[PDB]
C-alpha cells in the first residue's frame, strides 16, 4: 500500500474508499504482540496527506481511542501522538479542535510518560488554530499549573495569541 500510494501521487483518492474497512478492522481487533501491526498502519497513514481531505472524519476516531486507551504499550500511544502531529501539517483540523484537545489534557494529567510529546502536539495544533484557540486558553492553563509543565513554543504561541499578533 505504501509503495502504491507513493506511485499514485494524486490518484489514490479514487481507491482509498475500498481499503478503509480493513484498516478500521485492524484498529479494532489488533492481536499482534502487542500492537506492531497498527503501528505499521500509523506509519503508512502519515504519508496519505491531502488524500484524506474527504475521509479524515472516518480515520480520526480510532486513533484518539487508542490514544485514550491506557492499557496498550507506550510506543503505540506515542505513535498515535506523532501521527496526529504530522497530519496537522497538511490537513485542516479546525472542526476537530475540541475532539483533540480534551484527550490531550487527560493525558497530561494521567501520566508524565507522554507529557513531552503531548506538549509538542499542542504546539502544532495551536499554531494552526491561531486566534481560534483563544476560547480554550483558561481551561488548559488551569490543568498545566497543577504540575511543573512548561514549553518554549507553547508558551510563546499563547503569549502571542493573547497579545493579538501571531506572525
Amino acid at each position: 500500500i505504501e509503495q502504491i500510494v507513493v506511485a499514485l501521487g494524486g490518484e489514490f483518492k479514487l481507491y482509498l474508499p475500498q481499503l478503509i474497512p480493513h484498516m478500521l478492522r485492524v484498529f479494532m481487533h489488533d492481536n499482534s504482540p502487542g500492537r506492531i501491526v497498527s503501528i505499521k498502519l500509523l506509519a503508512a497513514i502519515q504519508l496519505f496527506g491531502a488524500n484524506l481531505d474527504d475521509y479524515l472524519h472516518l480515520l480520526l476516531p480510532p486513533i484518539v481511542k487508542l490514544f485514550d486507551a491506557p492499557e496498550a504499550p507506550l510506543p503505540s500511544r506515542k505513535a498515535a501522538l506523532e501521527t496526529v502531529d504530522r497530519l496537522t501539517e497538511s490537513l485542516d483540523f479546525t472542526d476537530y479542535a475540541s475532539r483533540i484537545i480534551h484527550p490531550i489534557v487527560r493525558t497530561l494529567d494521567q501520566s508524565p510518560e507522554l507529557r513531552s510529546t503531548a506538549m509538542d502536539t499542542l504546539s502544532s495544533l495551536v499554531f494552526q488554530l491561531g486566534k481560534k484557540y483563544q476560547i480554550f486558553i483558561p481551561m488548559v492553563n488551569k490543568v498545566l499549573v497543577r504540575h511543573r509543565i512548561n514549553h518554549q513554543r507553547y508558551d510563546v504561541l499563547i503569549c502571542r495569541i493573547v497579545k493579538g499578533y501571531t506572525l
Partner: protein
Amino acid sequence: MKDRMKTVSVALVLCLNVGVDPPDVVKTTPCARLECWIDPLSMGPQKALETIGANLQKQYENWQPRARYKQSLDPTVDEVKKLCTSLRRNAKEERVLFHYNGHGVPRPTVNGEVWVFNKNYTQYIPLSIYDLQTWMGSPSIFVYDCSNAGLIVKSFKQFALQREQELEVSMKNCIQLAACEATELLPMIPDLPADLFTSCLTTPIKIALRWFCMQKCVSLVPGVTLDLIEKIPGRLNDRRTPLGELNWIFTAITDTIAWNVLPRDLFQKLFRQDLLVASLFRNFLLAERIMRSYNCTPVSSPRLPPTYMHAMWQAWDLAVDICLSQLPTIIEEGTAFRHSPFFAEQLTAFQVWLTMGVENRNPPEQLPIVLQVLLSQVHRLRALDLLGRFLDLGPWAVSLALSVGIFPYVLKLLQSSARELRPLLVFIWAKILAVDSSCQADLVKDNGHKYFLSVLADPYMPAEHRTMTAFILAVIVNSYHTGQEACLQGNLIAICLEQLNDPHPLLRQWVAICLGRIWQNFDSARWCGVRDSAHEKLYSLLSDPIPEVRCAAVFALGTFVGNSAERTDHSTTIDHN
C-alpha cells in the same frame, strides 16, 4: 490611491516545440497534451502553434483589451534581447508582463537554460536570469509555467541580491508567479489541460466547472455532466446569463477572501493599484485551491498567507450546485433562467450584524459584497440604505467604508438619472464630508455640486434633508475655493435669502452660515451682496429667541459688512447702520 502605475505591454514567449519530447519526458497514455483547449496532433507542427498563440492572445485580451501585444515563437538570444529592448522603449516607466511557457523545454537549471535553437535540438542555449533582469530593468511581472518553477524565482532573487551588492562598490519592483515549487513536477493527468496554471490564471471558469464535475465524490445533481457544462449559454460580461452571474459571484467571493485575510498594506497594493495585477492575484487564489489537490503548491512573490481553508469557498460550491440543477431543462425545454439568492442572503447577514455594532468587534466581513451590489440596478436601494445605517455609527465606521472604495462609485451614482435616490446620497455625503472634509474638490470639479443645488431648490423636500444639503454646500464652498464661482452661477444667494424665513432652527443657522461663507473674498458676490441688500434680511434674525440663530446672524452680518466695506463707496451707509 494616487499611485496609478499601469501595465502597457505583454510579451508572449512560447516554446511549444510540437512533435519533440525532451529526453526527461515520461510518456504517453495520460499525457493529455491539451493546450489552450487545442490538441496539436489534429493540425500539424505549424498550424497548431499559430492557432495556440492566437488563443493565448484572446485569453489575455479578455482582461486588458488595451494592452500592447508582443509575441515570439521559439526566440533564441538576440530575438529576446531585441523584444525586451523594444518593449522598454515603448514605455520606460510602466510595467511589462513576461509570460514563459516552457512545456517543450528540459527541466530548468539554476541558470534558466532553455531549448531554443535553429530547428536542431542539439543547440540547447544556456540563458542567464541576470541578463534577463538587465534587459527588463523596469517594474515588471513574471509568469513561469516551468515544472521546477520555484528554482527560477530563487535564482532571480539571488541574482538581484548579487546586483545590489555589486552596486554597493529591481528586487523591490518585480512580482513573480511560479506554477509550483522547485522540488515538484506538474501533474500528468489524462483529463486535465497541460497548461493548468495558465488556464486557472486566464480562464477562471471552464476548468473550475470541469474540476467540480470530476472532483465531487458523489454528485448531488443527477444528469449534469461535461456534455452540458460545455454548452452553458452566454457571454462572460452579460450580467443576466448563467456565466455572467457566476463571474459576478466569483469576483465577489475572491475579493471578500482577500479583504478578510491580507493586511491592508498588501491589499491596497495588489487588489487596487492595477487592474491586471488584481485580476491575476484574484485568479491565483483559485489556482492555489485547485492545484493543491494534485500535490502542487503554487509559489508567488510577494508571499501570501494560505487561503484554501477559508469558509467562503463552501458558499461558492453551493452557488454552483444551485445553478447547475437548472441547466438540463433550460437546454432541453427552454425554461427561463432564475437568478440565485446569493446577494440577498449576504445583505441579510449584513443587516443582522447591524443589529448591535460596536467599535470593540471584528468589522463586518461582507463590505466587499455591498460594494459589488451597488454596481447593479436590482438591490441598489437596499444596499444604499444598509450602507447609510452602517455609516451612522461613529467616525470609525466611515474610515472602513473609505478603505474599501465606496467613494469613487458614489461619485458616479451622484449623476444618475434617478430621483428616488436623493435622500440616500444626501445622507451618505453629509456623513462623509462631516468626517472627511479633505476630499480634493471632487464634488466641485465634476457636476456633483449642481445636484446638491437642485436638491436644495426642491421646495417639497423635508427640512432634515434641506438642512443636510445646506451643510454640504457650506462645506464645499469654504473647503475648496473653486465652488466659489459655481455657487453664484446657480444663484445660491437668492435661494438662501428666500430660505432665511424657514421656521426650523437649523435651516436658519446653516443658511446664515452659507451666506457668511459666501461673502468672504468674492468680488462678484461683494457686488451681488450689496446689490440685493442681503443684510437687510439677516438682521431680522437678531430677534430670534434661540441664541444659536442670533450667533449665526451676527457671523453672517459682520462678515458681510467687514468684506463689503473694502469698496466703502456708498456702502458706508450700510457700514454704519
